[PDB]
Amino acid sequence: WVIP
Amino acid sequence: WVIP
Amino acid sequence: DSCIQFTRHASDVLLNLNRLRSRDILTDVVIVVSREQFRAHKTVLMACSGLFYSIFTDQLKCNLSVINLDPEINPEGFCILLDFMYTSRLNLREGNIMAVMATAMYLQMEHVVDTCRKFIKASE
Amino acid sequence: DSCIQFTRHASDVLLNLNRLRSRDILTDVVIVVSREQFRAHKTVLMACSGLFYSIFTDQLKCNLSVINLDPEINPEGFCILLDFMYTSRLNLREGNIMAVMATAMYLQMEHVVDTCRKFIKASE
Numbered sequence: 578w579v580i581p
Numbered sequence: 582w583v584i585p
Numbered sequence: 586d587s588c589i590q591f592t593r594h595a596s597d598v599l600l601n602l603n604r605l606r607s608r609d610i611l612t613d614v615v616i617v618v619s620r621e622q623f624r625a626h627k628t629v630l631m632a633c634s635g636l637f638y639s640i641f642t643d644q645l646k647c648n649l650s651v652i653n654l655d656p657e658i659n660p661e662g663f664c665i666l667l668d669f670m671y672t673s674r675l676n677l678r679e680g681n682i683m684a685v686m687a688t689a690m691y692l693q694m695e696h697v698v699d700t701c702r703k704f705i706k707a708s709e
Numbered sequence: 710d711s712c713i714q715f716t717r718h719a720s721d722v723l724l725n726l727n728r729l730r731s732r733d734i735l736t737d738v739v740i741v742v743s744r745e746q747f748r749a750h751k752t753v754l755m756a757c758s759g760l761f762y763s764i765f766t767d768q769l770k771c772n773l774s775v776i777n778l779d780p781e782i783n784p785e786g787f788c789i790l791l792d793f794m795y796t797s798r799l800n801l802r803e804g805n806i807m808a809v810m811a812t813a814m815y816l817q818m819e820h821v822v823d824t825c826r827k828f829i830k831a832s833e
């Protein structure tokens with residue numbers, strides 16, 4: 578999971 | 582396009 | 586093999602599937618979550634959820650145009666997860682995390698359940 | 710928004726769509742290319758090809774279960790492109806490049822046409  |  | 590790969594292809598396919606959903610193009614099922622209804626593509630639901638994969642591979646249920654979810658399922662939680670299926674983006678907030686996690690467990694979406702557990706553990 | 714994103718989601722969706730295709734699950738169209746037939750999902754075809762997007766948004770053609778391609782279309786070229794649609798991987802070889810490029814032009818798959826043009830220019 579990432580900060581887009 | 583890339584070499585996978 | 587000796588194939589070449591187009592990096593953005595999977596993302597572009599998903600963007601177009603979401604555009605088709607938004608325009609109600611070739612949607613083949615309506616998911617009923619208490620008073621709310623959500624139109625979708627069976628193949629996208631199956632590709633994202635262990636529960637839908639199970640339902641639409643069933644010889645009788647594969648032909649249904651309406652699927653009614655358990656009354657305990659929160660419509661907003663379902664909406665957030667349906668958006669995630671079509672975009673890879675999860676709108677996870679303090680006010681919805683419990684509903685999202687419960688819905689992801691029911692839908693059998695392991696990666697979502699995983700990030701919800703981690704976000705909850707960090708707040709305790 | 711304040712969303713989080715699962716990097717591998719789009720790739721995982723596409724892998725599952727390919728698995729469904731391989732098992733002939735919820736495929737809703739057969740593409741006929743001279744003596745050969747290819748089963749697929751209309752939504753994936755539309756999401757990858759300007760030609761299929763046009764065909765399946767047509768009020769009459771959207772309901773067809775069989776689509777016959779132009780007799781000049783090479784089945785191997787179509788097969789290579791259908792595999793690309795479901796995997797992001799293009800099996801581009803000296804022996805098939807002309808057929809693949811002609812098929813991609815017909816199907817309106819701009820990124821494929823682009824790499825074929827570049828590979829051809831490098832060999833001249």
Ligand SMILES: N#Cc1c(Cl)ncnc1Nc1ccc2c(c1)CC(=O)N2
Nearest residue numbers: 631632633634635693694695725728
């Ligand atoms: N459609 C399809 C499909 C196929 Cl073909 N093969 C394997 N899994 C498929 N989908 C599916 C099954 C289980 C789970 C998910 C997706 C996400 C998750 O957390 N569990």
Ligand SMILES: N#Cc1c(Cl)ncnc1Nc1ccc2c(c1)CC(=O)N2
Nearest residue numbers: 601604755756757758759817818819
């Ligand atoms: N399905 C869908 C779709 C939608 Cl909804 N919006 C916009 N394009 C869509 N698909 C589509 C249209 C034109 C082309 C491609 C795909 C690849 C390419 O080279 N040209």
Ligand SMILES: [Cl-]
Nearest residue numbers: 648649650651
């Ligand atoms: Cl029904």
Ligand SMILES: [Cl-]
Nearest residue numbers: 694695696697
């Ligand atoms: Cl997931």
Ligand SMILES: [Cl-]
Nearest residue numbers: 772773774775
């Ligand atoms: Cl027909």
Ligand SMILES: [Cl-]
Nearest residue numbers: 818819820821
């Ligand atoms: Cl393309």
